[PDB]
């Protein structure tokens, strides 16, 4: 399968979530930001690159967070915890960014695939 990596950026005990702007099916819904691994890249290479491109921040990539998600027959979606080395995140690509605490994770308007990670995200914040 092709891998899509996503980052759980936790700063000051809150989590960064990112509101998609495209495609139409997911626009307005919220996700862990990331994107597709390209040939030759490690998971950490790809995820750091994507979060530089998408958020303008330099992160260190940490442990896995929650289960792999089988997006479709081609693609596997994997989250990693990341931590902010430097920068403040800005939405280059996304409609909006938000910092959420444990009390907001369950109720958030997630993109379907990411919902699997809700307990794992609540735990990471607590």
Kindly give, in sequence order, each residue whose CB lies less than 8 Å from that of residue 122, ignoring residues fewer than 6 positions away: 102, 105, 106
Residue 121 is encoded by which pair of tokens?
Answer: 């995200």
Closest to ligand CDP by CB, 54 vs 84, is 54
Residue number closest to ligand CDP, CB atom: 35
What is the spatial distance between Cα 37 and Cα 91, in angstroms, rounded to a whole number? Answer: 20
Closest to ligand CDP by CB, 6 vs 48, is 6
Residue 85 is encoded by which pair of tokens?
Answer: 């080395």
Q: How far is the CB of 12 from ligand CDP (least distance, A)?
A: 21
By CB under 6 A, name the binding residues for ligand CDP: 4, 6, 26, 31-32, 34-36, 50, 71, 77, 111, 113-114
Q: How far is the CB of 101 from ligand CDP (least distance, A)?
A: 19
Residue 20 is encoded by which pair of tokens?
Answer: 């998609």
């Amino acid at each position: 399968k092709q891998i899509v990596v996503a980052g759980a950026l936790i700063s000051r005990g809150t989590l960064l979530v990112a509101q998609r702007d495209r495609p139409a099916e997911l626009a307005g819904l919220w996700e862990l930001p990331g994107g597709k691994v390209t040939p030759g890249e490690s998971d950490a290479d790809a995820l750091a690159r994507e979060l530089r491109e998408e958020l303008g921040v330099d992160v260190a990539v940490g442990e896995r967070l929650g289960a792999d998600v089988a997006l479709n027959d081609a693609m596997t979606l994997r989250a990693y915890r990341v931590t902010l080395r430097s920068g403040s995140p800005h939405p280059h690509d996304h409609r909006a960014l938000r910092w959420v605490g444990a009390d907001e994770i369950d109720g958030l308007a997630w993109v379907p695939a990411d919902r699997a990670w809700v307990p794992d995200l609540v735990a990471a914040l607590s």
